[PDB]
Amino acid sequence: RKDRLSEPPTLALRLKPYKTAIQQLRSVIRALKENTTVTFLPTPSLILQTVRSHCVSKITFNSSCLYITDKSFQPKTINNSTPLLGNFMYLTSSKDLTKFYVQDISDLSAKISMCAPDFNMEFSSACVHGQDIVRESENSAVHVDLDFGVVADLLKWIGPPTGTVQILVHAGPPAIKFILTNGSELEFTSNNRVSFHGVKNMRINVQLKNFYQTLLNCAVTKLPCTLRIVTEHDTLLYVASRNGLFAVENFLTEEPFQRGD
Amino acid sequence: RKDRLSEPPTLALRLKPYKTAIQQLRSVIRALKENTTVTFLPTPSLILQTVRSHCVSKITFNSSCLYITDKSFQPKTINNSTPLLGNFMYLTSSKDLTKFYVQDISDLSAKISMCAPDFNMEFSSACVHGQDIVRESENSAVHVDLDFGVVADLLKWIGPPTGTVQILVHAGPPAIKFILTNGSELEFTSNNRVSFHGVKNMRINVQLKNFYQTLLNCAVTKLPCTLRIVTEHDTLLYVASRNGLFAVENFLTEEPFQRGD
Ligand SMILES: */C=C1/C=Cc2csc(SC)c2C1=O
Ligand SMILES: */C=C1/C=Cc2csc(SC)c2C1=O
Ligand SMILES: */C=C1\C=Cc2csc(SC)c2C1=O
Ligand SMILES: */C=C1\C=Cc2csc(SC)c2C1=O
Ligand SMILES: */C=C1\C=Cc2csc(SC)c2C1=O
Ligand SMILES: */C=C1\C=Cc2csc(SC)c2C1=O
């Protein structure tokens, strides 16, 4: 055309940070379940969400990975499981990826472009719905930060429904107790490696499989890990860990154990 | 535009025949070696070629699979191994494939479009060279057709360099002898299941691994199989089998066994 320029809003991945994060995460990415969602936001942000039985898991890439040309970019959530490609996020963890951007060309779909040395491809996936808003905009009733050394001790101790783990929190003094069904309890009291910010005398029960998976997911950061028991409405357990590149968050509901039908 | 219509030359797959052939071939397709080539011809034709040590293997899809809009479509050969997708022909054997065509838009590349229910993608790969012409436009000095029952007997008998098999052909009367290094020979004389069209008293030696692989490849047709010993220049063994959808051809050179440096 001859007037003034115009390119559709474009959400681009910055390769060096993104490639660093997707390698660190390549364990989690290949294991992503068939119903996993990818969301692109003009914030900018990129969110992987997996909704399970009693667990919602979320992986948020932060701005350091993203460049957005134009903030009128409309939000898009697509299925990670893609009709011919399969695991889309896995595709992006290829080593010879050179360009990776998303364009807002239709309100109905999302145009993904990817490049490699002497090759380029694009596809569009239908936008799914949505809006699958499930966020931690609610503050904790008990909040505990665990040094990573503690995360590994927990993992190592849970080895190994197919079981539940009880979590007990004391207030005076503060302590946190992990109670398996077999009569073994693992406890942490105040010390340089576990910080109790807010705390009250309470207990919830979660599924052991999910909590273990949850802990594995946070441990990719090899950084501290945040444990919250939100008492909003649904009794909730929040486990999360983050670095400069991304944030692993997990929302586990208590297994209904208080009467009961 | 406002004048007369114009669409770039397009080589399209007819799904029902193509999907039938790619399923019948899904064993061979996934095993395709990293250096496998795909060629698109305005004939129309589609050719998969693999060049090995002493073996060139070729899979030709015939017209019943292809529709060509415009015969000015330029020939294109690309790598099957694709920078982000990996095995391209494997990708096309997906069950929810709904459209598969190739367009001549650049003399330098090939634009592949593929569709699935609510999804579509395209990519271009650089045209490689070429021209990798290796064809059977030379007639046999010995030519033997084997009933499929014979192909399976051969396969079953070769169980199981890492060995060679000698192939001996008699002329008066005609017979064909397969001689392993261990002193076991398998012979076929004239009967309703092996037809000797042209024949002379000669022997060549080929690598056992390749010949066995070659036989496996022809056997996907469960139809007769053509055995030729071309005496052009390079002493050559040709093994092939075809159906209405495609043609498996194999060119094996004799292992230099006649002095010798
Ligand atoms: C974690 C709990 C609180 C302390 C304590 C003393 S004895 C015993 S076993 C019922 C406990 C306990 O489980
Ligand atoms: C296939 C060959 C031709 C017939 C025959 C008779 S004895 C013997 S062993 C040297 C053969 C043979 O190998
Ligand atoms: C009318 C225009 C404005 C610039 C330009 C450069 S090449 C090309 S194609 C005819 C054009 C164009 O379309
Ligand atoms: C926490 C999530 C989960 C996916 C999704 C779809 S739209 C949107 S904006 C708040 C989100 C999100 O942030
Ligand atoms: C000038 C033309 C000729 C037909 C047509 C139908 S919709 C559309 S977009 C302005 C056109 C066009 O470009
Ligand atoms: C026998 C082959 C092998 C690949 C190729 C590239 S171009 C062309 S045309 C004769 C061929 C071919 O037919």
Swiss-Prot record, chains A, B:
Phosphorylated by UL97 on serine residues, phosphorylation seems important for UL44 nuclear entry but does not directly affect its role in replication. Sumoylated. It comes from Human cytomegalovirus (strain AD169) (HHV-5). The gene is UL44. The C-terminal region is required for viral DNA synthesis. This is DNA polymerase processivity factor. GO terms for molecular function: DNA binding; DNA polymerase processivity factor activity. It is found in: Virion; Host nucleus. Accessory subunit of the DNA polymerase that plays an essential role in viral DNA replication and acts by increasing the processivity of polymerization. Forms dimers that binds to double-stranded DNA and UL54 specifically to stimulates long chain DNA synthesis efficiently. Plays an important role in maintaining the structure of viral replication compartments by interacting with host nucleolin/NUC. In addition, suppresses innate immune responses through effects on host IRF3 and NF-kappa-B. Its main location: virion. Changing I133A: Complete loss of interaction with UL54. It comes from the Viruses. The chain holds residues 3 to 276 of 433 of the full protein. GO terms for cellular component: host cell nucleus; virion component. Keywords: DNA replication, DNA-binding, Host nucleus, Host-virus interaction, Inhibition of host innate immune response by virus, Inhibition of host IRF3 by virus, Inhibition of host NF-kappa-B by virus, Inhibition of host RLR pathway by virus, Isopeptide bond, Phosphoprotein, Ubl conjugation, Viral DNA replication, Viral immunoevasion, Virion. GO terms for biological process: bidirectional double-stranded viral DNA replication; DNA replication; symbiont-mediated suppression of host cytoplasmic pattern recognition receptor signaling pathway via inhibition of IRF3 activity; symbiont-mediated suppression of host NF-kappaB cascade. Forms homodimers. Interacts with host SMARCB1. Interacts with host NCL/nucleolin; this interaction is important for the organization of proteins within viral replication compartments. Interacts with UL112/UL113; this interaction is necessary for efficient viral DNA replication. Interacts with UL84. Interacts with the uracil DNA glycosylase UL114. Interacts with the DNA polymerase catalytic subunit UL54. Interacts with host IRF3. Interacts with host RELA. Belongs to the herpesviridae polymerase accessory protein family.
